[PDB]
């Protein structure tokens, strides 16, 4: 029913999303349960800093979750791209926890970093889609993102799944706080919804195809805060997928312009950023939540730290359709 293995597994995303969660997340009393680390959480809760080492899309899932990780656990969280992390030979110690987010679980510069980390005493955690990958083997432990065999060039379904995992992670770390308890369920009750919210984004597919007639070599993702990671990812996409040139940037430190203005990332600074383009007159594309010279794509409103999950879909849909329109093997 879909002409590309990239396209099916963009739509796979309602399921891939829930598979990520099934069993591990308990929605009625709110207990997330990652047996993958039942053995090491104790240690992590009490650890110096958590360092995120990842690549391509996996790097963007780290950005996208950093924010909520940190709030949820109060720990120095930081996100390092493995290629770089190596060049810089960051010092790392025994108190440190090193979380590696992989789809493949085979990425070279990751594995290198993993080794470096390992031989340097740090504790290691894999966040891997793949079964019995290298990473899987060498890590002290780590979650299996439990998505479904990814088979398109692009890390489409993988992304959102990782994102969810990463969250479930942050929750399970932080599961012994009465003060967070409120915000714990919120997110969880909201996670339950995420999968069907995914389907309702996949209806804009029609309006998105539509939008692919006025576009021409370029595109800018205009994000801030939570929806920053989404901007950069959307950017990675267009490039990686459509062999056009996108560049995600942070709203207004300052011509087809995607600008996320979902409520979770609606700053005056994003505001004036758009207001500033509307006066220039080039039609920007405004992603945001139902009921708010341009065009605007709706996305149902979720708990802000899950908001990134939805907003990225239109991004995949566009990028896919930008490569259909150019007759390119998307697989």
């Amino acid at each position: 029913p879909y002409k590309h293995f990239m396209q099916k597994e963009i739509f796979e995303q309602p399921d891939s999303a829930f598979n990520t969660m099934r069993g591990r997340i308990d929605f009625e009393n709110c207990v997330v349960t990652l047996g993958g680390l039942k053995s090491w959480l104790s240690t992590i809760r009490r650890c110096r800093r958590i360092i995120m080492i990842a690549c391509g899309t996996s790097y963007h899932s780290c950005l996208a979750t950093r924010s909520i990780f940190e709030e949820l656990t109060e720990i120095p969280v930081s996100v390092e791209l493995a290629s770089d992390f190596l060049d810089r030979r960051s010092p790392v110690f025994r108190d440190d926890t090193c979380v590696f987010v992989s789809q493949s679980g085979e990425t070279a510069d990751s594995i290198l970093a993993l080794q470096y980390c390992l031989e340097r005493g740090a504790l290691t955690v894999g966040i891997v889609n793949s079964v019995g990958s290298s990473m899987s083997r060498q890590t002290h432990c780590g979650v299996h993102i439990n998505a479904g065999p990814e088979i398109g060039v692009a890390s489409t379904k993988a992304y959102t799944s990782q994102y969810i995992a990463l969250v479930m992670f942050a929750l399970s770390l932080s599961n012994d706080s009465i003060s967070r308890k409120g915000r714990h369920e919120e997110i969880i009750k909201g996670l339950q919804k995420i999968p069907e919210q995914i389907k309702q984004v996949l209806k804009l597919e029609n309006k998105i195809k539509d939008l692919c007639n006025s576009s021409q070599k370029s595109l800018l993702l205009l994000g801030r805060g939570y929806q920053f990671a989404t901007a950069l990812e959307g950017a990675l996409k267009i490039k990686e997928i459509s062999y056009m040139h996108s560049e995600g940037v942070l709203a207004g430190e300052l011509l087809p312009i995607i600008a996320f203005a979902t409520r979770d990332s609606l700053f005056p600074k994003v505001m004036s950023a758009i207001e500033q383009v509307t006066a220039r007159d080039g039609r920007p594309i405004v992603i945001c939540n139902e009921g708010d010279v341009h065009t605007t794509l709706e996305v149902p409103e979720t708990v802000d730290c899950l908001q990134g999950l939805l907003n990225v879909i239109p991004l995949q849909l566009i990028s896919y359709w930008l490569a259909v329109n150019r007759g390119i093997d998307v697989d």
Copy 2:
């Protein structure tokens, strides 16, 4: 005797830079004296981590030094964007040390963060040029890069001085390590060489002029390693000053316009090489900033080459950046635009 103020203060650098070190560093016996911190140092030494909070160019000085703070001190160092950091509401604590870096001292978002960090118990440090700045009042302690009064519309000299500052900051903290004195005296000496070395790069002004006639709409700077800050820096200079578009990218990550490329020996990796290959293979001419006497392109291919002195790796950025100011200035002149 220059046509713009901003052009002036670029050549102010082999001087602003000297004064930034002047009397704060001893070259005979290789120690570094930063008065302001004098009563907070051993404190900063024993601390959990360092968050550097900054804006525009100040963010980049922090990036360029980030690698080296870590190296010297082994304190975890995070570089943060003033505006952004705030939006996140990152949890901050007593054990924390928050270096605030400003040329001005009055940047709005920088301040709310200084207040924020202050509100939450953290130790606050202020690295500024400006005198009386809101910052330097409310910061627990701090330093004045002390480079002069900047009259150009963006941070040229300030960047480099800030840089220098941050580095002496990084040296101060690591002064009690015997297995470092080697690379300490490595760094401090090469520091002393900096200003004159700036001068050989300023001579490179002519070549840079002529380049601007073969460059227009958007520019790719390319960097990895130490020179990955300078990439986003030139990207910013170009972006702000010359009112073109630019973007620095991490090299070897993944039609026919300019390509600045940094192949100084601190930042030469295979991926920086491949980076070039495919560009020289798409038969397009890059501009290769790199050390005097370097066959970076099998020379049969067309490409300019800007030529820079070779210094201590973590210092190189201070040089690599000048040609990119010089570039970002003349383009703005050529484009008619008043660089003040």
Copy 3:
């Protein structure tokens, strides 16, 4: 209606104790409110370690709670002697939290340490009874056990209140843990039972009197576990008040005099048992402080038995200690000595 002030304030305890908790703890919904710390708490939570600095009896309240602070908070807790700590010049830092415990607030060595810790950047907390005390001024924050004005020559009520204090201190810090609410509500409830339970022990005054006629020159108190603070406490009471000699020892470590022995169920280990055996085997009579209804000695052997209510383990010490005050008082009376 008592013959000495000190005797008075012992029976003041089921009251001084109530006031120490009074309005600072909610029994319906099991949370604990300590005003003073209110703006320093989440800070104390995220901190490296806790050094408790104290003298005489105040040192012992800190010991008795040390086990339980750790348990509740998982912050590393070190108990230190004011005088000694100073002599060592222990290195202290910003991340540090230094609980100073005083009944008086003006103990000389306690102060120099508060200054010392202050001089060196550490967070300083003041747990005192006294109002206006030098301490409570200069401490960053702190609490008043708020137990009353102590007119006896040594710390009876104060100890127990201090204790209580420290515990509520320990509860406050661990209030945000869901896997603790169980033992929290365990502790807070048993706290509410404390004062009356004091009363059953004060009834034990008669028995204690008669004991003093079968006891003289030097006394061995014996303890391990929770009750190892109470050991050195009675050792001190006896030492100071009754002007005998005493010494508490950790039980089961390795001619014919008195032996106090604590066999309450918090502090019952094999080594506490063997401890007894060999003493009951040397055919000498111990005095076994322990819970009502306990065959601690196969009863055929001669030995008194003081009888104490059974409470939450970390609280037990508050009870076990009274009989030892009662002892240390009457001996001093009998010995003629003016206990004020």
Copy 4:
């Protein structure tokens, strides 16, 4: 030439002392080199706290060195008696380093703690006299105190050796500081001397025997600060060895009275403590350094943190001679 295996190896102490040091300590440029941890120091220098778990004499070596350890490394150092440490079930984590000082390397409550520690994630370090003892086996690493087979009931030679090891340890941790560099050599140059300084204490042996005619069931060790550990050890001795009753206590928080008044531990508080007994009139025994109703035993003056090493010898000598005079198997 000595009538007891306890007595020989009290005198063995010049040699046992230097054997502890040979090769590992380099006296001319001042490098202490413990290959036993060449593999873990990196980690220890950077670790949360160091916890000392020991027994009998081994506990007292920890006290005796705590002081200089802490000054030399600035780390939370703490000394826990294993029996207790267990009862209290102290929480302990991955950042933590746990140093176990054993002569035997077989002590039960130690081994237990070691296990506890281990199964709780902490890093473990043995400080063991014995070759291939249990401790030896289970530790991440640890020094071999390299004394000589101890064969008397008492931990005589063992003590001082441990003490030295413990120091060499603290040094090697702290070996990368320019500010300490001064105080580093001082101690080292002073360590060189320690062994012969030992011999000159062993001449008081004559005067000590002598002193064992006025003594009678008791004895108090009166120490403060550095010489506190020595007081408690001297106390352990008399009891353990002579089946008399000693009780080491800290100077003056207030009748044959040993009071250490070596220069390293000469406080006004020790002062008034003695001055206070001289007025009572009972002849106290004053240990101190050559040239300063009582009796007084000389002990050459060493670098204060090594001072404890000497002062303990007269203590052994007395305790030995208190058990010769009572016709007790000292072996």
